[PDB]
Amino acid sequence: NNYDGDTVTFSPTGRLFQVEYALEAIKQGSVTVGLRSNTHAVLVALKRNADELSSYQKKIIKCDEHMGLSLAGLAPDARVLSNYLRQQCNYSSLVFNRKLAVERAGHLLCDKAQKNTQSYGGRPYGVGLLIIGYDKSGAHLLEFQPSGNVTELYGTAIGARSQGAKTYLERTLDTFIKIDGNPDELIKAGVEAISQSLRDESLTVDNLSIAIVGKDTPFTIYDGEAVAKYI
Amino acid sequence: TSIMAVTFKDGVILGADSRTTTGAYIANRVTDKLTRVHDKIWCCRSGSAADTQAIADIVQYHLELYTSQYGTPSTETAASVFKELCYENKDNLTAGIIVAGYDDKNKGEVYTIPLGGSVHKLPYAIAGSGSTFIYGYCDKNFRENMSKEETVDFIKHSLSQAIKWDGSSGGVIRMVVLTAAGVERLIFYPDEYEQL
Amino acid sequence: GYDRHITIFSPEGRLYQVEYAFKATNQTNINSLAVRGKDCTVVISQKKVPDKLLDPTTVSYIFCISRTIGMVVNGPIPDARNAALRAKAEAAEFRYKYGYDMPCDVLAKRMANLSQIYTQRAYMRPLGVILTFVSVDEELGPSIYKTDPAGYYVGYKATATGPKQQEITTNLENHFKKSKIDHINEESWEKVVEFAITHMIDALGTEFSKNDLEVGVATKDKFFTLSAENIEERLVAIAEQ
Amino acid sequence: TTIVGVKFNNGVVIAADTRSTQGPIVADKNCAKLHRISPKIWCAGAGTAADTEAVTQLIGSNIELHSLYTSREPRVVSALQMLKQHLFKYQGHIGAYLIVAGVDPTGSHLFSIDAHGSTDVGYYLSLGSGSLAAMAVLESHWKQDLTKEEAIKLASDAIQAGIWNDLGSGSNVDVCVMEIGKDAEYLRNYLTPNVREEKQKSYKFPRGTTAVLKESIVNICDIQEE
Amino acid sequence: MTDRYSFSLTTFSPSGKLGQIDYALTAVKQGVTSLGIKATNGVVIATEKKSSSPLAMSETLSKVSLLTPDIGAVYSGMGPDYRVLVDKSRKVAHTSYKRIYGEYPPTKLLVSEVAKIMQEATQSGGVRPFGVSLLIAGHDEFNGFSLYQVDPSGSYFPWKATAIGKGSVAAKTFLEKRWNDELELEDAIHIALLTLKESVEGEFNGDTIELAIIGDENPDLLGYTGIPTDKGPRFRKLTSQEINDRLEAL
Amino acid sequence: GSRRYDSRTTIFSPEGRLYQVEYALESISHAGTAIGIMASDGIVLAAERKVTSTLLEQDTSTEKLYKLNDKIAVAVAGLTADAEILINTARIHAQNYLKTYNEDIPVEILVRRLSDIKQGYTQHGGLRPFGVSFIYAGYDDRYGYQLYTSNPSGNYTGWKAISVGANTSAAQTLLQMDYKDDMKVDDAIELALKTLSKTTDSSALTYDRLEFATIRKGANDGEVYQKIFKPQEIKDILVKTGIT
Amino acid sequence: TGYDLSNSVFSPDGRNFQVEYAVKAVENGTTSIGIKCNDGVVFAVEKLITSKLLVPQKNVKIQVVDRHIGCVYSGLIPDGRHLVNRGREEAASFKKLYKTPIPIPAFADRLGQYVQAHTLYNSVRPFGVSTIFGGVDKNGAHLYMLEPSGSYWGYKGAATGKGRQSAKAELEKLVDHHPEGLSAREAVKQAAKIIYLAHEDNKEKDFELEISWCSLSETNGLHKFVKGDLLQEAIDFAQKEIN
Amino acid sequence: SDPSSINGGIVVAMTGKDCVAIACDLRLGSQSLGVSNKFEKIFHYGHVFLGITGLATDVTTLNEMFRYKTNLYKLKEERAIEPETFTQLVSSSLYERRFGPYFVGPVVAGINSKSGKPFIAGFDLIGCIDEAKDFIVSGTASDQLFGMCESLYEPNLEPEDLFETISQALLNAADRDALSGWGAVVYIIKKDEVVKRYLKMRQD
Amino acid sequence: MDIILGIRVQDSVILASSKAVTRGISVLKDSDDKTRQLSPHTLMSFAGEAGDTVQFAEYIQANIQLYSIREDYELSPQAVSSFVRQELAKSIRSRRPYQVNVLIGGYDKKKNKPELYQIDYLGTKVELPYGAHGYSGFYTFSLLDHHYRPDMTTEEGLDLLKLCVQELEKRMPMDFKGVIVKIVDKDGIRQVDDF
Ligand SMILES: [Cl-]
Ligand SMILES: [Mg+2]
Ligand SMILES: [Mg+2]
Ligand SMILES: [Mg+2]
Ligand SMILES: [Mg+2]
Structure with a gap:
């Protein structure tokens, strides 16, 4: 009200409204799902078009051979944060000959977002991210909020109507965690999860976007006729 | 310079000569090379007098x-x-x-x-x-x-020999004793340590 | 009405942020007192530990700035420690640059100049503290110099700070009106501390245990604080006459 | 250059010769080498003459401001500390070699300063090209508990040794006495043992000896009215 | 952090007034009265030592300050603002003059430098004006004795005699009746004490009054002998006893 | 943050005016009147000191007329402290030009430089403008005798006769009535004083309330002299012209 | 009014309302505690299980500084991480120059001055966390608690977050019933109980317990996390006490 | 190679009874090659006179610099600068270039307008003041000038006698220096009149 | 480059400059014009280190042309020469100084007088009746000292210049491939196309 003009102002109840408004941009964004087993980790993302002449906005970005994310909200902010992750993954490899841990990648994203919530002049990031990866401690899935809060999960979903997919994963928890050594079945579960968030529209060949990383599987993105198999 | 520090049962003792040279000229024959950086933390200085000060x-x-x-x-x-x-x-x-x-x-x-x-x-x-x-x-x-x-005897005899052979060292032998009892300054003149 | 938010003049020629910083000074609800002897300067302050979970040894508003200078603060602890760290840095730098120990009055002036800047520059707020510096100066002898959020400072024969400063001030005024001298005519610092505690008891109308007080003493070449058992010995002597 | 400093009973005295040179040529026969840092803190300088004055006036200026700020009379240790730190920063490139002496509320003091920033303490000191000649006299005649009259005598004798035996030094002896609880007395040309003898001949020319081409009045006044 | 107040806090209002300067002058009006009188052979500046507490040692607070050996200053308004201006004024006398010309600045030029500092606090970013008016008295070889007033705006004017602060209007009227061009220094001191008594409520003595003069050279205050051309400072602060002696012949 | 307290000194109004410049001009309209008149054989600068006192030391006082160099002078109307900042800058610029080209700075080049400095404060920096208007009286060998004015906007214009400060509307009408092109300095002196005498808000025009200056080629042969009038000399010219 | 819209502005009371609003964010956070024992310190925290999809034991909240200091906080988690990052820089520079690991009181002031600095200007926001921290140094065990204002004191026991009143009462009982002191292993057990008891203020969702400790005898003066059998033993002790 | 002897030239100054004199040669060269016989080395700012020997570019630069500074001085002080004050300004200005100096040998001469006292002073390239009672010398034939002045000079010479002494000192010194000569100028300075005389000398 | 000469006569200034450009072993060009017009009545010739010469001359040209447009007025030769001197005096204490020597020939329309200024790379300025840079003066000055008169015509000045060039062509070891000659007078600048 009187306390939402900038990010440097707490409200009388201790809230940061500019950060909450940045969180609101994520809820307007298109749905994206993340889930993992012990061998693989999967991202599924519903891409959004402007109209029938337009292309479908890309949702998944590769950060390294063993790591990548999906976005929901302001796409340019995801480009800035993913570029930062690419650099940090790269610094780790060049200097220490070491693949960057997924947990440590989450810590770096948290700290970068935090600086934009405590200083005058700047603004919070207006995007949410789902980071998947496979490192020395197996498969990982992270959820990033632009408040700075990063959380490690078995599965999750962000964007509009994400609550349906999140409930489905909460039921299926015991089943999909056990899908080891079978990439196709893990993606099937992810496609079935994101389907619980659809209304009026369905999953078409240029609508669906899938990514996977695992034990002997580099981070690869599937689009176009490559995902017709899963429709 | 000739400087030394020696630990013993009750604490530590610092020792030094008093000669400061510019070439062969003794610019100061009564220099104090034992320097206080804290109540019971002292140092001995050698090398450039400007730098160590x-x-x-x-x-x-x-x-x-x-x-x-x-x-x-x-x-x-x-x-x-x-x-x-x-x-x-x-x-x-x-x-x-x-x-x-x-x-x-x-x-x-x-x-x-x-x-x-x-x-x-x-x-x-x-x-x-x-x-x-x-x-x-x-x-x-x-x-x-x-x-x-x-x-005290070990330091006195040691620096006496260092002074005897090194042209750059000479003058009086200064010492500072550091123990629980406090801080004691000692001085020994040429007539004393040369006859050792 | 933004002339009340930053340090600019109001139509009356007043600085409201400075005035409100003076009010923050009494937020701790603690009273302090300082007096001079023949060879020493004594400062006492109330100690209040309201929580049982607190470690009482860490609760303190008296600071050892240098070997010779001590400082008691009236105001919130964050601003107090801010001022303490800065004073310590200034005292050390002074000794390094000019080759002798920073006098009590000179440090007071320096911290007062820093406070003045906060009243003139808009981006910096005033610190909500009153700083009382004490020492036995090698040139001026026993010394009390006090600084406030306005950037004002002055020397004192004796002084008092806190919510009930006026009661303590008048009590001290009346004593010096009798004796007609600028100090406590006493040889030992122990008896000067006893004078300070006695006259605070009289002015406030309250009794003190060993944990209710905090004492600092300045002598030639050192300033030190008394332990609870040192204060107890002081309280026993007061009660026995 | 020959400069000395000598401690005595109730104060300190410094002295210096008055010759300044450009290689083998005498630039000034009555040079003033005793500089004032503050009313009761004086120093004598050897080496690069511009540097010794420049560094003395800078520190003297800052000492004055410091004295006003603290409401205290300046101390010799403050002048010493400010001088050595300045000279150390410039790594010897500021060629100032100083003997600093004075009285203050702490007492009487005598220090020497080298261009690289090293300082030392003493009862008697000497600096400059004639320092070895001066130090020979000081090592021969110095004792503990000198009077004011004895210290002035010893200091000037040490400068004389420099004047007569060192080609870098000459002409007159300047002295400054700083006693505790008294005004510092600056004795300019305390000794004058090198007056030139009368010449054999006058070299005043008959008027009109020099050939002249043109004469003209130079306008030094400003632009005039009317 | 960083100082993000890079804009002016003093601005013109629709009527053409600079509000912050006017309000600074209002602060000066509330301040304790100080005055200055120029004589044929000297200048006097005076003020009341308004002690905040009787426990306070008012000798440790100097309202009259030496700027150079031949220049002094007194104020009315905010004390802390005055103290930092004296520090800056003393330094600028050296950095922008003595380190260049090897001599102390004349009164009018030092005043000019102080004025510049006060003007900049009226236009620079993120600062308020100084809440003081200064009276600066001094002597120099080519201009002789002079007295200047400096205001929060940075404006300065030369005076034969004047007053600033609490009771300035009444004090200036009193000075107009008494001042003439044939006054000796002692006559000016006498008039200064008479004028100041009107604006003082309580005690009026050497311990509650601060008074200094710019007069003859004081070789006794120089600190050294041996240089004929150095004859000592013309600034001298009168003692408590010296003031009381002149209050008997009042 | 800090934005809250920013007055924004360098913005346009909906009508396309610079608020602060307009308000600074309002300030200048209350300042003492300054007049400049240009003749064939010289220039006159006359200006009124604001309500003075009998205890003001006049002979050592200067609030209106300032020397920039030997050939150029200025009359001030507005904040004196603001004017002295600019005056010192102008004195330095003249000396920079003299060092570079070994010739005295042409009057217009100096005027343009100061005016450009004023302009900067209206377009960038977020600072308040200088509350000063200048009348420049000067001579160079290109255009001869010249009169200019500049104001807080940084705009400058040339004049045969001009006034700044208080009552400029009334003053300009009186000058427009009695000014002629073949006029001489002694006639211009009289016009300037007569104009001030009629436009003044004071009861009468006396020597102690005036500052006066002339720039004449009345200097012995081909050269120019600046004359800042002394108090006694202003008193004499007032009797000569028949005002007192 | 308007005094609460900008940081570093004194109200007519002499209060900084923005700092007081930061405390509200701290009070909204989960419960965290600290217990000072005979030769060390114990830290514990309540972690709310928002969903079954949270991986157990993975989202670690307690943080180490250097190798001998533990830090836990309630309120805005990112703000706490920013404070710990600064603390790690402060501890690194101290050890770089002075060789010895930073003493706990020295470390406390470094955090305090940094937090206090965020109350001096309107260009920054105050910290939305209260931090409980401590460890073992050359002079023994130390426990501190630091507020948004920059204020900190030493403590025998400390608590913050939504269930702070409940926790404080439990800590006060331990101080009274053990004047001679508490052992390190006892403190771990007691810490588990207090978090379980303080969970009544957050009873809607179930939670995960996390404990750490520094002890001269039990951990050689190094900070370590309580894991496996010792953690389960403390959970069993806690569950037994609530029933 | 040596900057102080590329262009050549000399300046000398002397005191007399209620007067001072300052004189210089007129040569400017490029080592052996004589380039100009009209290069005057004496300048004046009000009643204060400044001679400058050494590297010619710096001679020109410093003249322009001190004209600049004495003009600003006059506007602010409302009076002409005096010899004693100007001497300090030259010293300050030279020392500010301590580690990148102007390669010059300045000489100040003038009479104090208030006391009437004759004044002369000399400087090294980096600011050290030599303020002699009798005479000051500078330039590539400074050794020769020291020899002439030391024998020819006597105190309290009348203006017209002082002219002969300083003229003979310059001329004979210049004739023993390859890089000096090609004409000469002598200024005789009294409290309110200054006379300038060009001398006839050998042109080799 | 090599030889640059200048002579000021009654009513004009004449500048002569060599045409050769040599890159060590070979003569790359024999028609090079070592001069720039700064203003309608001011010409500057130059010689020094390769590259620096033209870079400096064009930089000066641009500055004087900028001044002319801003003020709608041509600077005097004296004013231009002072500006050039200051730039070279500034240059000599730079990181990498301009190694350039110049002659400035101009006709002052106010005083109705020709003027010749000689400035070397150090910033050493002198006004002269005739001047040169490098070794050019060593061969030519003895002839100019003998024959020069202040009341010479332009045609007499050119004839005296021919005698100077002939002496250079006889006694100099280097082949400078003749000279381009330009005249500066009240009507402006023109080139003598047969010399
Ligand atoms: Cl300060
Ligand atoms: Mg030996
Ligand atoms: Mg402020
Ligand atoms: Mg010759
Ligand atoms: Mg020859």
Whole structure:
């Protein structure tokens, strides 16, 4: 009200409204799902078009051979944060000959977002991210909020109507965690999860976007006729 | 210069000659090379007189500010502050410093910091141009846990020989005793130590 | 009405942020007192530990700035420690640059100049503290110099700070009106501390245990604080006459 | 240059010769080498003459501001600390070699300063090209508990040794006495043992000896009215 | 952090007034009365030592300050603002003059430098004006004795005699009746004490009054002998006893 | 943050006016009147000191007329402290030009430089403008005798006769009525004083309330002299012209 | 009014309302505690299980500084991480210059001055966390608690977050019933109980317990996390006490 | 190579009874090659006179610099600068270039307008003041000038006698220096009149 | 480059400059014009280190042309020469100084007088009746000292210049491939196309 003009102002109840408004941009964004087993980790993302002449906005970005994310909200902010992750993954490899841990990648994203919530002049990031990866401690899935809060999960979903997919994963928890050594079945579960968030529209060949990383599987993105198999 | 510091049962004693030279001219025959950076943390200076005075003054400032915030510093801490200055400015400095101090927990300690800026904790240390001539004597005659009187004699005899052979060393032998009892200054004149 | 938010003049020629910083000074609800002897300067302050979970040894508003200078603060602890760290840094730098120990009055002036800047520059707020510096100066002898959020400072024969400063001030005024001298005519610092505690008891009308007080003493070449058992010995002597 | 400093009973005295040179040529025969840092803190300088004055006036200026700020009379240790730190920063490139002496509320003091920033303490000191000649006299005649009259005598004798035996030094002896609880007395040309003898001949020319091409009045006044 | 107030806090209002300067003058009006009188052979500046507490040692607070050996200053308004201006004025006398010309600045030029500092606090970013008016008295070889007033705006004017602060309007009227061009220094001191008594409520003596003069050279205050051309400072602060002696012949 | 307290000194109004410039001009309209008149054989600068006192030391006082160099002078109307900042800058610029080209700075080049400095404060920096208007009286060998004015906007214009400060509307009408092109300095002196005498808000025009200056080639042969009038000399010219 | 819209502005009371609003964010956070024992310190925290999809034991909240200091906080988690990052820089520079690891009181002031600095300007926001921290140094065990204002004191026991009143009462009982002191292993057990008891203020969702400790005898003066059998033993002790 | 002897030239100054004199040669060269016989080395700012020997570019630069500074001085002080004050300004200005100096040998001469006292002073390239009672010399034939002045000079010479002394000192010194000569100028300075005389000399 | 000469006569200034450009072993060009017009009545010739010469001359040209447009007025030769001197005096204490020597020939329309200024790379300025840079003066000055008169015509000045060039062509070891000659007078600048 009187306390939402900038990010440097707490409200009388201790809230940061500019950060909450940045969180609101994520809820307007298109749905994206993340889930993992012990061998693989999967991202599924519903891409959004402007109209029938337009292309479908890309949702998944590769950060390294063993790591990548999906976005929901302001796409340019995801480009800035993913570029930062690419650099940090790269610094780790060049200097220490070491693949960057997924947990440590989450810590770096948290700290970068935090600086934009405590200083005058700047603004919070207006995007949410789902980071998947496979490192020395197996498969990982992270959820990033632009408040700075990063959380490690078995599965999750962000964007509009994400609550349906999140409930489905909460039921299926015991089943999909056990899908080891079978990439196709893990993606099937992810496609079935994101389907619980659809209304009026369905999953078409240029609508669906899938990514996977695992034990002997580099981070690869599937689009176009490559995902017709899963429709 | 001829300087040395020796730990003993009750603490530590620092020793030094008093000669400062510009070439063959003795610019000061009554110099005080034993310098106070804290109540019971002193140092011995060798090398450039400008450099070692500048360093000691900065260390004294650092330890005074340390004391106001965190209480009495350790001898190890004082040696570290000396090292940081000597190492990081090695290209522009010519300083060889021996740091000696007395804690109640750690008792007498000695740290030597040569040209490069390395640190070496030792039971006793010798340095300066005149030290070269007494490596043999000191190694043969040093014992651990000596008494105050024995340590005074060891330093007196050692620096006497260093003075005898090194033209750069001479004058009076100054000493500073660091124990739980406090801080005692000693001085020994040529007529005394030359006849040893 | 933004002339009340930053340090600019109001139509009356007043600085409201400075005035409100003076009010923050009494937020701790603690009273302090300082007096001079022949060879010493004594400062006492109330100690209140309201929580049982607190470590009472860490609760203090008296600071050892240098070997010779001590400082008691009236105001919130964050601003107090801010001022303490700065004073310690200034005292150390002074000694390094000018080759002698920073006098009590000179440090007071320096901290007062820093405070003045906060009243003139808009981006910096005033510190909500009153700083009382004490020492036995090698030139001026026993010394009390006090600084406030306005950037004002002055020397004192004796002084008092806190919510009930006026009661303590008048009590001290009346004593010096009798004796007609600028100090406590006493040889030992122990008896000067006893004078300070007695006259605070009289002015406030309250009794003190060993844990209710905090004492600092300045002598030639050192300033130190008394322990709870040192204060107890002081309280026993007061009660026995 | 020859400069000395000598401690005595209730104060300190400094002295200097008055010759300044450009190589083998005498630039000024009556040079003033005793500089004032503050009313009761004086110093004598050898080496690069511009540097000794420049560094003395800078520190003297800052000492004055410091004295006003602290409401205290300046101390010699403050002048010493400010001088050595300035000279150390410039790594010897500021060629100032100083003997600093004075009285203050702490007492009487005598220090020497080298261009690289090293300082030392003493009862008697000497600096400059004639320092070895001066130090020979000081080592021969100095004792503890000198009077004011004895210290002035010893200091000037040490400068004379420099004047007569060192080619870098000559002409007159300047002295400054700083006694505790008294005004510092600056004795300019305390000794004058080198007056030139009368010449054999007058070299005043007959008027009109020099050939002239043109004469003209130079306008030094401003632009005029009317 | 960083100072993000890079804009002016003093601005013109629709009527053409600079509000912050006017309000600074209002602060000066509330301040204790100080005055200055120029004589043929000297200048006097005076003020009341309004002690905040009787426990306070008012000798440790100097309202009259030496700027150079031949220049002094007094104020009315905010004390702390005055103290920092004296520090800056003393330094600028050296950095922008003595370190260049090897001599102390004349009164009018030092005043000019102080004025410049006060003007900049009226236009620079993120600062308020100084809440003081200064009276600066001094002597120099080519201009002789002079007295200047400096205001928060940075404006300065030369005076034969004037007053600033609490009771300035009444004090200036009193000075107009008494001032003439044939006054000796002692006559000016006498008039200064008479004028100041009107604006003082309580005690009126050497301990509650601060008074200094710019007069003859004081070789006794120089600190050294031996240089004929150095004859000592013309600024001298009168003692408590010296003031009381002249209050008997009042 | 800090934005809250920013007055924004360098913005346009909806009508396309610079608020602060307009308000600074309002300030200048209350300042003492300054007049400049240009003749064939010289220039006159006359200006009124604001309500003075009998205890003001006049002979050592200067609030209106300032020397920039030997050939150029200025009359001030507005904040004196603001004017002295600009005056010192102008004195330095003249000396920079003299050092570079070994010739005295042409009057217009100096005027343009100061005016450009004023302009900067209206377009960038977020600072308040200088509350000063200048009348420049000067001579150079290109255009001869010249009169200019500049104001807080940084705009400058040339004049045969001009006024700034208080009552400029009334003053300009009186000058427009009696000014002629073949006029001489002694006639211009009389016009300037007569104009001030009629436009003044004071009861009468006396020597102690005036500052006066002339720039004449009345200097011995081909050269220019600046004359800042002394108090006694202003008193004499007032009797000569028949005002007192 | 308007005094609460900008940081570093004194109200007519002499209060900084923005700092007081930061405390509200702290009070909204989960419960965290600290217990000072005979030769060390114990830290514990309540972690709310928002969903079954949270991986157990993975989202670690307690943080180490250097090798001898533990830090836990309630309120805005990112703000706490920013404070710990600064603390790690402060501890690194101290050890770089002075060789010895930073003493706990020295470390406390470094955090305090940094937090206090965020109350001096309107260009920054105050910290939305209260931090409980401590460890073992040359002078023994130390426990501190630091507020948004920059204020900190030493503590025998400390608590913050939504269930702070409940926790404080439990800590006060331990101080009274053990004047001679508490052992390290006892403190771990007691810490588990207090978090379980303080969970009544957050009873809607179930939670995960996390404990750490520094002890001269049990951990050689190094900070370590309580894991496996010792953690389960403390959970069993806690569950037994609530029933 | 040596900057102080590329262009050549000399300046000398002397005191007399209620007067001062300052004189210089007129040569400017490029080592052996004589380039100009009209290069005057004496300038004046009000009643204060400044001679400058050494590297010619710096001679020109410093003249322009001191004209600049004495003009600003006059506007602010409302009076002409005096010889004693100007001497300090030259010293300050030279020392600010301590580690990148102007290669010059300045000489100040003038009479104090208030006291009437004759004044002369000399400087090294980096600011050290030599303020002699009798005479000051500068330039590539300074050794020769020292020899002439030391024998020819006597105190309290009348203006017209002082002219002969300083003229003979310059001329004979210049004739023993390869890089000096090609004409000469002498200024005789009294409290309110200054006479300038060009001398006839050998042109080799 | 090599030889640059200048002579000021009654009513004009004449500048002569060599045409050769040599890159060590070979003569790359024999028609090079070592001069720039700064303003309608001011010409500057130059010689010094390769590259620096043209870079400096064009930089000066641009500055004087900028001044002419801003003020709608041509600077006097004296004013231009002072500006050039200051730039070279500034240059000599730079990181990498301009190694350039110049002659500035101009006709002052106010005073109705020709003017010749000689400035070397150090910033050493002198006004002269005739001047040169490098070794050119060593061969030519003895002839100019003998024959020069202040009341010479332009045609007499050219004839005296021919005698100077002939002496250079006889006694100089280097082949400078003749000279381009330009005249500066009240009507402006023109080139003598047969010399
Ligand atoms: Cl300060
Ligand atoms: Mg030997
Ligand atoms: Mg402020
Ligand atoms: Mg010759
Ligand atoms: Mg020849």
